Design a protein around this ligand. Structure first.
Ligand SMILES: Nc1ncnc2c1ncn2[C@@H]1O[C@H](COP(=O)(O)OP(=O)(O)OP(=O)(O)O)[C@@H](O)[C@H]1O
Ligand SMILES: [Ca+2]
Ligand SMILES: [Mg+2]
Lengths: 124, 368
């Protein structure tokens, strides 16, 4: 994959969040990290530095209760593609609104928030 | 810009459409009809619905058996018809995503590729496993997909986006077998459904009145004592018949293959068996993400029954979750439509240049 966002992904320790927008992976502005639209699906990459030098990866695809089939389907596929791009070093996690893992919730020191709305489905 | 096509070649029904659409535009029988005799029924052959309607003067052939293409001459006919008559496109203008059955023979993958590039001159193409497309359509990268259509039934464990071939299993019983079984048990009431139009009535009864019992032996007793479970079905003329325990006995065959004389394990056991062939460390995930796909998984009550059956086989600790989307008859196609629509899919396609460089063997390195 030659996606600009893939080139940026997992370069250094930290948290990266993208939102699925009409079949594409769009970065979420850092100022909006933790504020999830329930009508959308997102892909979150948590890069953790390893003592050996190489980075640890955990990919989480978060699914809003009202996101459409194309959004959740795209989020799952982008997750597989990013894992593949990162030489299969990422552990993938499906995070459903209201049932997110403690690990994921923990990425947001302030506590994550849900907000109704989002972008429309990319079908038809 | 450019629009990709998505074609799911089923043993029974072909689903075709455009990537980005939420449903296929053409859904038709996977049949090629040629002149019955050799005399004077106009064209050289027919495909799909037209073939089925003109069956009086044609001999129908089914190129796809158990999800595997067994006649390439007839498959080309089906593809030609799909492009020019069903989708109304010039194939040379569109990348084409085709689906395949789990464990599709290596030689068949190459042949499918050769035909697309050499016969239809597609600028690009891709082959995806049906089960995996259904998992993606459900928004998951890990799970076990139970795909039951017209050919055979497959249980396909998938981990982080990829199927685990060693754990793929199968029950050689599917839709047609159940229609045939319903046809049979209905005769035991005193009904005769032997013609094509009659088999169609039976198939409709199967699709509209059948259901999976949570507790079969108890459903049986309920029926042997009351007319509570009985329905009535109005035939095309006006003749009315009454369907009784055949409603749940027909799909019961999926759980009890012995009903069809098979010594095979039912779908719940096959699912459990597939999960047990996988690394212990991923089994929890599989149990919680058992996804149903295909027309033959459309029976009401099937998910509740699968949950109950798999729960009895797995440790009481394991959380069992059966996912049965209402749109599962088209899950494979929808998965394909989403995949081919992604901005990141451009480099995934096998291009004309690549085919020209390596030949059909390119499919084993681009589509795995
Ligand atoms: N509501 C329904 N209830 C039960 N069976 C149904 C229902 N709708 C369709 N079917 C059955 O599903 C079958 C067709 O399914 P499907 O389209 O998934 O198969 P296919 O793609 O052609 O087969 P395969 O994947 O084996 O190649 C037929 O036997 C049909 O009668
Ligand atoms: Ca949305
Ligand atoms: Mg199918």
């Amino acid at each position: 994959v030659e996606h600009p966002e893939f080139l940026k992904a997992g370069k250094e320790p930290g948290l990266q969040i993208w939102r699925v927008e009409k079949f594409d992976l769009v970065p979420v502005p850092t100022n909006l990290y933790g504020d999830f639209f329930t009508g959308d699906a997102y892909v979150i990459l948590k890069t953790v530095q390893l003592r050996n030098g190489n980075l640890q990866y955990d990919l989480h695809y978060w699914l809003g209760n009202e996101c459409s089939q194309d959004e959740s389907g795209a989020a799952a596929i982008f997750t597989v593609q990013l894992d593949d791009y990162l030489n299969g070093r990422a552990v993938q996690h499906r995070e459903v609104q209201g049932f997110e893992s403690a690990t994921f919730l923990g990425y947001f020191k302030s506590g994550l928030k849900y907000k109704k709305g989002g972008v429309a489905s990319g079908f038809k | 810009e450019v629009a990709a096509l998505v074609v799911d070649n089923g043993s029974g029904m072909c689903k075709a459409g455009f990537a980005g659409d939420d449903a296929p535009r053409a859904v038709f029988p996977s049949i090629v009809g040629r002149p019955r005799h050799q005399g004077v029924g106009q064209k050289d052959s027919y495909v799909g619905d037209e073939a089925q309607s003109k069956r009086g003067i044609l001999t129908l052939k089914y190129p796809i058996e158990h999800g595997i293409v067994t006649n390439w001459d007839d498959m080309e006919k089906i593809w030609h018809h799909t492009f020019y008559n069903e989708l109304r496109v010039a194939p040379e203008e569109h990348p084409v995503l085709l689906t395949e059955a789990p464990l599709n023979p290596k030689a068949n993958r190459e042949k499918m590729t050769q035909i697309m590039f050499e016969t239809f001159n597609t600028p690009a193409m891709y082959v995806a496993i049906q089960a995996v497309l259904s998992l993606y359509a459900s928004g998951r990268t890990t799970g076990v997909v139970l795909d039951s259509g017209d050919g055979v039934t497959h249980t396909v464990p998938i981990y982080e986006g990829y199927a685990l071939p060693h754990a793929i299993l199968r029950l050689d019983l599917a839709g047609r077998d159940l229609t045939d079984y319903l046809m049979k048990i209905l005769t035991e009431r005193g009904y005769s459904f032997t013609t094509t139009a009659e088999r169609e009535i039976v198939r409709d009864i199967k699709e509209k009145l059948c259901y999976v019992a949570l507790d079969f032996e108890q459903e049986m007793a309920t029926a042997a004592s009351s007319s509570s479970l009985e329905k009535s079905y109005e035939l095309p003329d006006g003749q009315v018949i009454t369907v009784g325990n055949e409603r749940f006995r027909c799909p019961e065959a999926m759980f009890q293959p012995s009903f069809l004389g098979m010594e095979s394990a039912g779908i719940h056991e096959t699912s459990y068996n597939s999960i047990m062939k996988c690394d212990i460390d991923i089994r929890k995930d599989l149990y919680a993400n058992t996804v149903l796909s295909g027309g033959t998984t459309m029976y009401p009550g099937i998910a509740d029954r699968m949950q109950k059956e798999i729960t009895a086989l797995a440790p009481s600790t394991m959380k069992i979750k059966i996912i049965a989307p209402p749109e599962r008859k088209y899950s494979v196609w929808i998965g394909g439509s989403i995949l081919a629509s992604l901005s990141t899919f451009q480099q995934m396609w096998i291009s004309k240049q690549e085919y020209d460089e390596s030949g059909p063997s390119i499919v084993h390195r681009k589509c795995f």
